[PDB]
Amino acid sequence: MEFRQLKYFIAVAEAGNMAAAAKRLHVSQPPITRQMQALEADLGVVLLERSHRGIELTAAGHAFLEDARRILELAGRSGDRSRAAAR
Amino acid sequence: MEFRQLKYFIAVAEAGNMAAAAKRLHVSQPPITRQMQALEADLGVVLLERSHRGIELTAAGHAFLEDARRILELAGRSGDRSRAAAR
DNA sequence: CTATATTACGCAAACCGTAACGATG
DNA sequence: CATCGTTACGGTTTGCGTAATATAG
Numbered sequence: 001m002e003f004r005q006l007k008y009f010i011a012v013a014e015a016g017n018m019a020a021a022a023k024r025l026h027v028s029q030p031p032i033t034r035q036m037q038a039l040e041a042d043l044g045v046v047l048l049e050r051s052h053r054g055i056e057l058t059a060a061g062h063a064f065l066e067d068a069r070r071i072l073e074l075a076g077r078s079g080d081r082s083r084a085a086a087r
Numbered sequence: 088m089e090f091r092q093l094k095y096f097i098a099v100a101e102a103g104n105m106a107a108a109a110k111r112l113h114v115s116q117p118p119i120t121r122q123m124q125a126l127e128a129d130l131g132v133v134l135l136e137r138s139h140r141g142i143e144l145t146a147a148g149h150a151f152l153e154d155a156r157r158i159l160e161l162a163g164r165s166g167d168r169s170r171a172a173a174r
Numbered sequence: 175c176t177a178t179a180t181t182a183c184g185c186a187a188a189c190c191g192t193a194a195c196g197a198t199g
Numbered sequence: 200c201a202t203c204g205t206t207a208c209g210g211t212t213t214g215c216g217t218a219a220t221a222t223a224g
Contacts, residue, residue: 001090001162019203028191033205035189043166045173052198052203063172067165074161075088078154082132085150106178115216120180122214139178139223181220188213195206 003075005039006068008032009047013065017054090162092126093155095119096134100152104141 008025015021018032025032040047047061057065095118098108105119112119127134134148144152 001166003089017203029203030192030205031190037205043169045169047169050204052201054203058173060169060173064165064169067161067168071158071161071165074154074158078151078158079088079130081154082130082134082147082151085146086132104178116178117180117217118215124180137179141178175224177222177224179220179222182218184215184217186213186215188211190209190211192209193207195204197204198200198202 001039001042002035003072005035005042006072008035009039010065010068010072012036012048012055013057013061015054088126088129090159092122092129093159095122096126097152097155097159099123099135099142100144100148 008021008031011021011024012018012032015024018036019029022029022032036048043060043064045060045064046058047064049056049058095108095112098112099105099119102108102111105123106116109116109119123135130147130151132147132151133145134151135142135144
């Protein structure tokens with residue numbers, strides 16, 4: 001897993017199609033499709049139903065999505081805590 | 088912040104010095120020092136006091152160590168779930 | 175002279191963006 | 200056949216490991 005994959009996958013879930021997701025992240029489309037492939041590979045599971053319209057989430061997608069949000073939340077807060085702890 | 092920095096940090100924290108963590112992660116020592124620099128910069132905090140005898144954690148680092156462990160654990164379990172939900 | 179950390183340098187692998195191709199409602 | 204997803208390719212960057220540098224016992 002990479003932090004980058006989590007952010008990208010969250011955006012794709014919220015967008016409903018990979019092009020829109022890319023525009024929201026300020027990258028080109030191909031990094032989106034490739035990073036999703038690496039994620040699905042790394043997890044051993046299909047997160048996304050592809051069509052020419054866009055994407056739907058699988059059961060394993062809806063599961064993962066919830067946890068991706070929480071890993072990002074926790075990473076963010078872990079930083080604020082450490083910085084606070086300095087003082 | 089990257090997952091690899093979290094693993095490396097935990098290993099450095101447990102080991103008491105960078106050389107022994109390096110061996111336990113099966114990499115040379117310079118990635119360890121460099122990835123601790125990258126991590127410290129990205130958080131904007133100092134986690135470790137370096138001496139010639141090894142390392143000791145700051146307040147900031149004791150905090151971050153616990154959350155490091157939470158994040159990785161949560162990342163592990165989130166895999167397991169997503170695979171389980173694909174049954 | 176050992177043990178630790180850091181820095182320098184060279185080469186390989188990863189990663190992005192443009193461009194081409196493919197597939198489908 | 201218009202629109203989105205994927206794959207190819209070239210060029211930049213990141214990132215390793217070996218070797219060198221610096222400090223301390």
